[PDB]
Amino acid sequence: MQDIDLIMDIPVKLTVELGRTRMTIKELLRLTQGSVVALDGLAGEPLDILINGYLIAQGEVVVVADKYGVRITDIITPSERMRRLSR
């Protein structure tokens, strides 16, 4: 509608997250330069795409001539979103 066009003039910010993990503060203090930290996500899984910190879609990492890119694959339809938030 016309208000969709009005908010179209408003820029927004997109965020791509590689993964997430949980650990104690003591473990973080144990970490030093060159330390290795694992993530919950596996290899080849689509990465989360966030708009102002809200996940809306998923994509795959590509490189464009010198720049990283995300190839959108799937959405976060309410059933899947509720399932992943329940975790």
Partner: protein, 289 residues
């Protein structure tokens, strides 16, 4: 509930009880009673008035004109304190020091204090300063240094704004029919860092015990848990594009030289992504400091 806004209006800030400040005031009252009895050769009666929290302009408008205002500094705290002596108390002290029996009631003058009266005020001020310093020492080390004496709010601006919150503790001195009064005013920002010390009642010293308590608290908190999230990169886009996200859509992003690790939106370090043990890895480089 909905009201119109006026830039020339301000509200209050609940209650800020300072039991330690009241204890310091009582100790200073005892010391000043002893000092005044020593000086004037007569036994005074000092009553500690209720501690008052009010904007600076409200305190200023209640001061009789002219009045003796002395600027003091409570080192190492930053600011300028004020000691207020009413003209009646100064007149009573002058009368007592020069043999006056106090039978004749004081006459309203509204005149600048003489240099002899200035010296009387300085004699009172030194003892008051010693007493207040000794009283404050019981809870926290402080040094009081007098700066200058002024007779009007014109020579004030101890505070940036007239509406700034200040703490005023009145004191009533009685050596007979006389009921003279002196006040101590301190800006709230000066005592703001020591708010925790002044609010809760003081306990026994036990400085080593308190240090051990803090060390144990630090040790126990060190085992707490959090969530570490690393943001790969960010993209500026528009909502219309978001409505058209489909499989296979490629969005260009800037290649991040370093990966910044954030904890609940708080960056903690910058690293680089890697692949170790079949999972993504971050090679920590520098901590956010």
């Amino acid at each position: 509930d909905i009201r119109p806004y006026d830039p020339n209006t301000q509200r209050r800030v609940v209650r800020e009880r300072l039991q330690a400040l009241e204890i310091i005031n009582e100790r200073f009252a005892r010391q000043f009673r002893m000092g005044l009895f020593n000086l004037l050769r007569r036994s005074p009666d000092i009553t500690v008035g209720a501690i008052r929290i009010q904007p600076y302009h409200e305190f200023a408008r209640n001061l009789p004109v002219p009045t003796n205002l002395n600027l003091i500094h409570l080192k190492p705290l930053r600011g300028t304190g004020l000691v207020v002596f009413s003209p009646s108390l100064v007149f009573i002290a002058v009368d007592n020091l020069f043999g006056g029996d106090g039978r004749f009631p004081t006459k309203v003058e509204g005149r600048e204090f003489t240099h002899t009266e200035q010296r009387v005020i300085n004699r009172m001020l030194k003892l008051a300063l010693e007493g207040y310093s000794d009283a404050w020492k019981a809870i926290n080390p402080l040094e009081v240094e007098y700066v200058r004496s002024e007779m009007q709010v014109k020579f004030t601006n101890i505070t940036t704004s007239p509406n700034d919150i200040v703490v005023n503790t009145p004191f009533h001195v009685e050596i007979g029919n006389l009921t003279g009064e002196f006040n101590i005013c301190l800006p709230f920002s000066m005592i703001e860092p020591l708010r925790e010390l002044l609010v809760n009642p003081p306990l026994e010293n036990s400085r080593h015990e308190d240090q051990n308590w803090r060390d144990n608290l630090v040790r126990q908190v060190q085992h707490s848990e959090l969530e570490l999230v690393a943001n790969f990169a960010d993209i500026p886009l528009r909502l219309s594009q978001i409505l058209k996200l489909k499989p296979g859509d490629v969005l260009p992003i800037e290649k991040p030289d370093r990966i910044i690790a954030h904890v609940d939106g708080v960056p903690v370090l910058t690293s680089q992504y890697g692949t170790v043990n079949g999972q993504y890895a971050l090679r920590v480089e520098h901590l956010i400091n």
